[PDB]
Amino acid sequence: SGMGGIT
Amino acid sequence: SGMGGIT
Amino acid sequence: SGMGGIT
Amino acid sequence: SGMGGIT
Amino acid sequence: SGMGGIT
Amino acid sequence: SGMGGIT
Amino acid sequence: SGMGGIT
Amino acid sequence: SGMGGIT
Amino acid sequence: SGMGGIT
Amino acid sequence: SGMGGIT
Amino acid sequence: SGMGGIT
Amino acid sequence: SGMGGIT
């Protein structure tokens, strides 16, 4: 599992 | 603005 | 399970 | 404005 | 189960 | 199961 | 505007 | 399972 | 703008 | 599994 | 602006 | 702008 994003 | 998450 | 969004 | 959730 | 929305 | 949307 | 989800 | 979107 | 996800 | 995107 | 994550 | 990911 993990986390991430785009901005 | 942005999009993201944590699994 | 997790959480996320778009703004 | 936005959309999101927690499962 | 969980929660979420759109605004 | 899950959740989602379009706006 | 956007579309997305969590499964 | 996971999450994703388009904006 | 963008598109992305986490599996 | 993993994560990725295009912006 | 940017995109990134942690697995 | 860019595209990328983590497997």
Author numbering:
A (entry chain B), B (entry chain A), C (entry chain B), D (entry chain A), E (entry chain B), F (entry chain B), ...: 58 to 64
What did the authors write?
Although other intermediate filament proteins have been demonstrated to form amyloids, KRT8 specifically has not previously been characterized as an amyloid-forming protein. KRT8 is known to aggregate pathologically, primarily in the form of MDBs in liver disease. Atomic structures of KRT8 LARKS reveal that pathogenic mutations convert the non-pleated wild-type protein into a pleated conformation, shedding light on the molecular mechanisms underlying aggregation-promoting mutations in low-complexity proteins.
Segment crystal structures of KRT858–64 (wild type: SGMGGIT; G62C: SGMGCIT) for the wild-type protein and KRT8-G62C were determined. The wild-type fibril contains an anti-parallel beta-sheet, with PEG and ethanol molecules bound along the fibril axis. The central glycine residues (Gly61 and Gly62) adopt a nearly linear beta-strand conformation. An overlay of both wild-type–mutant structure pairs highlights that mutations from wild-type glycines facilitate a transition in the backbone from a non-ideal, highly extended conformation to a pleated one. Suggesting an effect of alcohol on KRT8 aggregation, two of three of our crystal structures of KRT8 segments showed the peptides in complex with either ethanol or isopropanol, each with distinct binding sites. The wild-type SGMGGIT structure (a) shows two ethanol molecules (gray) per asymmetric unit coordinated to the N terminus of the peptide, while mutant SGMGCIT (b) displays isopropanol binding alongside the middle of the peptide along the fibril axis, occupying the space between the beta-sheets (in gray) in the steric zipper. Both structures illustrate that alcohols can directly associate with KRT8 amyloid fibrils.
